[PDB]
Amino acid sequence: SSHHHHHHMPDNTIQWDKDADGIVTLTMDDPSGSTNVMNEAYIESMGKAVDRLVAEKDSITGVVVASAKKTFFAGGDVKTMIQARPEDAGDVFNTVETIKRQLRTLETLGKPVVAAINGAALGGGLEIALACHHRIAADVKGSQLGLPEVTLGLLPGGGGVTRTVRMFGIQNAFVSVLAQGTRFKPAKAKEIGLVDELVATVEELVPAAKAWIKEELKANPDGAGVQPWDKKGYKMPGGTPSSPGLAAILPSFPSNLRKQLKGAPMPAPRAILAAAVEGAQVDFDTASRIESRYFASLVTGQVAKNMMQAFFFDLQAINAGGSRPEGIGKTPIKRIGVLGAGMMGAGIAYVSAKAGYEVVLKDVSLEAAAKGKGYSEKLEAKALERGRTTQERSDALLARITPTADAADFKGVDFVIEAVFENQELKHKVFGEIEDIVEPNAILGSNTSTLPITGLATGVKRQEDFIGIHFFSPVDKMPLVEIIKGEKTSDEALARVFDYTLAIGKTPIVVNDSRGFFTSRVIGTFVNEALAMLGEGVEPASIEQAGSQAGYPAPPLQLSDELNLELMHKIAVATRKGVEDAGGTYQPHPAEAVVEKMIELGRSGRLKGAGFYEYADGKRSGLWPGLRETFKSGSSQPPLQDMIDRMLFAEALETQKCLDEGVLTSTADANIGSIMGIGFPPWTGGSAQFIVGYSGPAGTGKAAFVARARELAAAYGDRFLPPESLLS
């Protein structure tokens, strides 16, 4: 029973100040970083401080928890959590038990404790504030509050699950706070109950906190320093699992969770719900201990290591300019010129104008360019009826989009983004009529998905400023930009497109010039595996189920109808000629006969009104009934796990080829690119992490991946054979 981790060294994190009134001000200020982090230094520092609060309890009337950083407290020690092996479960349990033993003492001190939240209070930081009896937040820009542990495959283990359930009940805490790790602005945090009151500036926080302590000691003398769940007669909102109202719908919560996850093997939300329900059946101390066991179960697991690797380390390395060329400085952007007002160009104009950039949206006719701006008006309309933006910021956003049909209106443009039809000589003509009108330092970007950038760059004279800027539909909701580097593309143009991508709120990856780039090439193998299985005679329902249960956002046949089978055949015609020049021609993927059989029948996709699904009034309505008779569905019934592994391994093995050929320069670009670009399941950590984190009957690791790949190769074809680089 100790507030320290070891019953048998790092720098102090917390400053101590007791005033004349006996109010102690614990100011967290980790001297080894810019943000207070729940590391070994904090645990020991709060251990010393909590010991002192008990030793000097006779001369202490209240406690204020403040911070000297720009943020309040955001993050755990991910460097340590990712190294926790299953044999370390004893240490992980003892650590979170010590953390919560400190917070439980601070919570039951017999005197009010106030959190002075001056900035971002995320994860462990909010868990600190949740241990206080009153939370005051400063309404500053950039401040967020929430428990994002689930987005890293973890759960709020410092009491977040136990306290949010005691505050809001099982259903409200899980849906609103715990299950998705939602981040709340200080205003919305007070509205739901995570924060109790607000102040305008950070300078008022500590005075307002000490003032609330003085008033609480005088107005509520017996309830001071006592949480609602520690008073006699506490009633959990929504009831306990034994309450008749909740016991009716409670056995249906795991089925709702399995529907939202679509059967994907993400274990973190399962554990959070389990810890929440099991905790509401017992006292607070026993509930907190149950939460520790589930936390240790996640941290020592593999999925948590995948998601920690991708959504913390890999994503930070990208945002820290990992793929950005060294030495190059910043260059502003004043006027963005978008060529083409399709669904792509319209979405590009929206995300650019939403960031404050002036956009000139051009098309072949003024009627067309205006309809592209209507895409932004309809998005601002839905955003206004839901109350997410003001009427003044919506009018200023649309005012930055200027539709036109004259090439002369591209005067003063220093950042060109072409989003026309996929065709080389068309892109050559479109760039030829505007390349001398834009500024001489203008970036010449091409939103092409397959055509090599070096070939498109010959149609301009300033080839050093020509570069591929590949977006994903819908642009207003897809977070990745694929930046393709042509042979003549300079490092300055690369960095300027990199900075543009961060400015619009997206994540960039740098890709060297090659057919299919990285996203189009890898997602093609995913679609090709599904179409192959359809030709092999597998039920179309089983194929779509395999896609969703693998963890993909959209099942493969549904996606094929959206990618257009006509365009899918053109990629087969294009890649045919490239390999014929080398030798041995190319082995036509079995999916190609399936694409042709669908085009011959006049079903090319959602665009043409009919594909693998029947489309009535735009909305998709059921699979094509003639699909089973066309491909003799049902004659092949492989295990569902084999359908899933065939789709995951094809993309993973294709990613490894891209890393070998030099298409990608880092596994961070591979993981975040596959996750944020084409929708690789987040529980894998990315199509490159999937190899080193594979888990199944063969075991776990790169060796088990090679074993399973060879098992697939014996059954379904040698395209699943692992490359030399994965062999050891």
Binding site: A247, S255, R258, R270, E539
Partner: protein, 395 residues
């Protein structure tokens, strides 16, 4: 070694759920009333030779908690040596009580065992006892729990049973239940329930709608996240055709039933005449996500164990939890129509969970003697994907 015989099998009428006649009657009273009827039929029976009382009860809470079987022993003035044990195997709890009684008699360590079940669903609804699986989301997420209503619709989808097919069976069950009552089939087995003054409370199965037409069954409307969870396991199925309504599914009712089981020597000592013999029992199961396909392997097992086949069985009685469950059962084993649930079933008369197994058992005992037939096979689908089957032979 010893053979187990059925000496008597009685049941209460089944009162409906909404404004039911039995709603004011505690489930203990329903059991005690049947014990008193056995006393009126055979008053000179040495009750001390009754060595146990086994009752099935699916929701043993409230009025049905605290070992309702022992309560029936004390409240009815039975000897204190007569035991009393409650068991719960969901829907088959009534028949499981009969099977266990028969197996206890065969082992030679019990003489005369009273079995049956009781379920007052209007007073103790199903789910009232909670559930170790509903309160454990860590494992409920993995067993893929789906209400039996959807599993029935899934069976209709896979096997190709249309909405008109399940409604046609529901009409047949009403017609056969009405013909059985009017024909006097249930005259000696259904024991009317009375209050402490002798006044009548109920003497018929209230849940029956004998004026049912096929056009009215089509007007009915079929009964979050459950439909998508079921299709995750049965992935080759695109959509579930929802055909089951309140007109083609088992009714929620109150009732109780009793069966007296003992060895040949036990009956000879009390001047009792055996009515039927328990030939064999069997428990098996199938996939618990579809949850209602346990009857087929359990029936196949009880037939092999007794050395019999379908052609050797004269009457088939499967509980009518849902129409598709019975149609699936009839299709698998190729049951002739004229042998299956010949006196109607739970769609017409109701399904009082813990008591249904003993009710349909005693129903076949009577119909075998009425038809002068030889063998009958009784089976029930069970929650959790289980199955119980029993073969009786008339003596």
């Amino acid at each position: 070694s010893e053979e187990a015989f059925i000496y008597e099998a009685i049941r209460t009428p089944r009162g409906k759920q909404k404004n039911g006649s039995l709603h004011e009657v505690k489930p203990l009273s329903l059991v005690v009333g049947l014990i008193d009827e056995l006393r009126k039929r055979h008053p000179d029976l040495d009750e001390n030779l009754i060595s146990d009382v086994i009752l099935g009860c699916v929701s043993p809470v409230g009025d049905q908690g605290g070992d309702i079987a022992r309560a029936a022993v004390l409240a009815s003035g039975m000897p204190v040596t007569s035991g009393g044990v409650q068991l719960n195997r969901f829907c088959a709890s009534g028949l499981e009580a009969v099977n266990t009684a028969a197996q206890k008699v065969r082992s030679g360590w019990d003489d005369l065992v009273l079995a049956g079940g009781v379920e007052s669903m209007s007073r103790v609804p199903m789910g009232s006892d909670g559930g170790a699986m509903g309160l454990d989301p860590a494992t409920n997420y993995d067993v893929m729990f789906v209400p039996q209503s959807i599993g029935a619709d899934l069976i209709a989808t896979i096997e190709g049973f249309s909405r008109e097919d399940v409604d046609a069976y529901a009409l047949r069950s009403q017609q056969k239940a009405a013909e059985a009552w009017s024909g006097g089939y249930f005259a000696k087995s259904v024991v009317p329930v009375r209050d402490q003054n002798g006044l009548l409370i109920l003497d018929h199965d209230e849940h029956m709608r004998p004026d049912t037409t096929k056009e009215g069954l089509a007007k009915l409307k079929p009964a979050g996240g459950f439909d998508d969870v079921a299709l995750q396991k049965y992935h080759w199925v695109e959509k579930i055709n929802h055909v089951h309504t309140g007109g083609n599914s088992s009714g929620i009712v109150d009732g109780a039933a009793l069966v007296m089981i003992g060895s040949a020597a036990a009956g000879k000592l009390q001047g009792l005449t055996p009515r039927a013999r328990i030939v064999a029992t069997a428990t098996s199961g199938a996939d618990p996500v579809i949850m209602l396909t346990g009857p087929t392997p359990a029936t196949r097992k009880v037939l092999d164990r007794a050395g019999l086949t379908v052609d050797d069985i004269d009457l088939f009685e499967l509980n009518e939890a849902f129409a598709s469950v019975v149609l699936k059962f009839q299709k698998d084993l190729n049951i002739p129509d004229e042998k299956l649930n010949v006196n109607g079933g739970a769609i017409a008369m109701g399904h009082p969970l813990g008591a249904t197994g003993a009710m349909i058992l005693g129903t076949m005992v009577d119909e075998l003697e009425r038809r002068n037939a030889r063998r009958a096979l009784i089976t029930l689908c069970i929650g959790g994907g289980m199955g119980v089957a029993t073969i009786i032979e008339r003596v």
